Structure formats: C-alpha cells, structure tokens
C-alpha cells in the first residue's frame with residue numbers, strides 16, 4: 582500500500598543520521614510502512630498536524646491493548662481531560678520551580694560530586710541515567726537504587742508499547758510489568774498513607790479528593806513517573822550533553838553563559854532527537870490527501886521528519902544554538918496528549934548540565950572513543966548513544 586522502509590534500527594557514529602534518514606524518507610513519500618515497527622509511519626507535516634488535532638479520528642486507544650490500560654495516556658475525551666487536569670497541577674510553572682529549588686538542584690550537585698576523583702567516566706550511565714532516576718526516587722520517597730534495579734524491566738515495558746504488533750515485545754512488556762508490580766504496589770501503599778510527605782503522596786491525595794484513587798489509577802501514576810520521568814528523560818539529557826561535547830566551542834560558550842542552556846536543549850532536540858514522535862490509532866477510514874488509512878490501524882506520527890527540513894532550518898546538519906526562533910520540539914507529541922512531564926524534563930536537563938559544566942572546566946569527550954547512535958540504543962526505545970566517555974580534568 583505504502584512503500585516499505587527501515588527507519589529505526591540503523592547504527593551510525595553520526596548523531597545526525599537519524600534525523601537525516603527521516604527527512605529523506607519524507608521527501609520520497611508521505612507515509613511509509615516500517616518493516617521493524619510493523620505499521621505505517623506518517624512523515625508529512627500537514628498530515629501530522631491534522632492527526633494531532635483530530636482526536637476523534639486519531640485516538641490513543643491502542644494503549645488500551647497493553648500495560649498502560651487504565652492510565653492517563655489510554656484515556657479519551659472527557660475521561661482523559663479530567664485526569665489530565667489532575668496531572669497538570671503538578672507540572673505548573675511554579676510547581677516546577679519548587680522542584681528545581683527543593684530537589685533537582687541539590688540532587689544534580691550530588692550526582693556531579695560522585696564523578697569526582699576519576700580521570701574519566703561515562704556520562705551516559707553515571708550522569709544522564711543517574712540524575713533522572715534520583716529525582717524520581719525523591720518524588721516517591723524511595724532510594725534510587727530500587728529504581729536502578731528495574732532498568733531491564735522498564736525498557737522491556739517500553740519496547741512492547743512501541744512495537745505493539747510484535748508478540749515477543751508485547752509479551753516481554755506484560756511480563757516485565759508483572760515483575761515490577763510488587764515494587765509499584767509497595768510504593769503506592771506507603772505513599773497512600775496519611776503519613777506520606779512525598780510529592781507522590783500529594784498526587785495520590787488529589788486523586789483521593791476526586792474519588793479517582795482506585796488501585797489501578799494509583800499504580801498507573803507510579804508507572805508513568807518511571808517510564809517517562811526516569812527512562813525517557815535520561816536520553817534527552819544524554820543527547821544534549823553529546824551535542825555539547827561534539828561542539829567544544831559551543832560547550833565553552835554555554836559554561837561561560839549558562840543562560841544559553843535552554844537554547845542548547847531545544848536545538849539538541851532538533852539536531853539529535855531522542856524520540857521520533859507518537860503512536861495513534863485510526864478510528865475510522867480516513868483519506869489524507871491521496872493517502873488512505875483503514876479503521877483500526879495503529880500508526881506512528883514521526884514529527885521529527887521536519888527537523889532536517891532545510892527550508893525551515895538552514896544548514897540543518899549544524900548544531901546551532903543561535904537559531905531564531907528556536908526550533909519547535911517534536912519529541913513530546915502534540916494535541917491533547919502532549920507530554921505533561923515535559924516541563925520537568927526540560928528543567929532537569931538545564932539544572933543538571935549547569936552543575937556538570939560548572940564543576941569540570943576541563944570536560945571533553947574521550948577523543949578516541951566514538952559513540953554509536955541508534956534508535957534502540959541499549960535496548961531502549963530512544964535514539965541515543967551507547968556511551969558518552971569523557972575526561973574531566975586537563
């Protein structure tokens with residue numbers, strides 16, 4: 582029906598290959614069928630914009646088939662709106678500033694402390710993964726090590742949400758959720774008590790006030806903070822520091838002027854996105870110009886196919902934090918489901934990188950050890966590096 586393509590599981594030492602591959606595909610056809618994802622990938626900007634706006638035709642009901650069933654992302658319409666308002670409260674600008682001052686700045690200093698006393702470290706495992714894990718730890722009131730133990734299971738959960746037609750991926754996702762249910766239940770039970778003094782405690786109290794604090798709803802709060810708050814945020818941090826390490830003159834500008842960090846992060850989401858976009862379910866036969874999609878089909882909206890559009894972003898292969906306006910991020914989705922955690926993720930990248938750059942004026946990539954980039958790095962559902970080895974001192 583649509584041309585066949587292999588857009589995702591392709592390794593390269595070039596961080597731009599992923600973005601370039603999606604743009605080139607979009608130039609050849611508006612929709613491709615990906616041989617690994619097993620579903621159509623929409624690449625054309627106008628079609629993606631139509632799809633994000635029309636939730637009656639492009640739903641998230643495919644999440645009712647997997648481990649997110651019962652959670653926010655699987656909800657539609659008014660049910661979705663009501664729970665979305667609860668989540669929104671916890672990610673308002675002032676709430677985020679409060680997390681920055683109370684939790685994220687001190688944690689970032691502690692994570693950077695642990696890198697001291699070593700000539701070289703891997704910023705992927707030792708920084709990019711560590712910081713978001715410890716922030717979620719703080720939100721749960723549980724030791725970050727307990728989350729560290731779930732890494733394989735977390736990635737197994739996510740792989741089956743994306744490759745949802747692959748029986749091995751779906752089975753491993755459901756099994757991994759089963760194998761994490763004890764920890765999730767323990768966290769919910771403790772922070773459901775009147776003695777809770779954690780942010781998760783506050784979220785569960787708000788659900789209780791709305792008579793929404795079912796067993797399933799409370800487990801799904803915890804699940805969403807793990808999958809988005811820990812794992813997915815790690816790769817944004819990783820890709821931003823890679824972009825700076827790969828462009829030493831820009832890294833030096835940003836250490837001398839930390840007010841440039843928001844720009845470095847936004848341009849990094851364009852230049853080296855950690856995500857392609859979203860999944861949607863076609864709810865009724867629909868025509869997109871001369872393209873036809875059948876009711877029941879699950880699709881990917883690959884919003885990042887526009888990142889390397891040279892009419893929009895001249896010299897798109899250049900990491901340029903001076904672009905104006907800054908590029909609109911495509912990694913958080915769109916429409917009514919646009920990532921509710923995005924303010925926290927953006928703030929963690931800024932505060933974490935600020936602490937790292939201030940602490941290590943000599944920071945530089947290990948010249949000899951080039952990272953390899955792929956969608957699916959380390960069995961994740963992210964486009965990112967396999968390692969970020971650095972030298973910390975001159």
Ligand code: HEM
Nearest residue numbers: 654805809810813814817859913914915918919920922926
């Ligand atoms: C770089 C970091 C992150 C990326 C790239 C990301 C990406 C995404 C994407 C693509 C979606 C689906 C949007 C759609 O269907 O339109 C999403 C939804 C969601 N994310 Fe994030 N996420 C990140 C961090 C976070 C964090 C830190 C949290 C929580 C603290 C979080 C919680 C959620 C939730 C609850 C939803 C479902 C929203 C809804 O369906 O209304 N995510 N995220």
Ligand SMILES: CC(=O)[C@H]1CC[C@H]2[C@@H]3CCC4=CC(=O)CC[C@]4(C)[C@H]3CC[C@]12C
Nearest residue numbers: 654805808809813856857858859860962
């Ligand atoms: C590939 C990627 O990074 C994106 C594509 C679809 C996104 C997900 C969509 C659903 C979702 C809802 C949550 O509550 C947590 C985050 C998640 C689990 C998202 C994580 C990141 C994902 C997996």
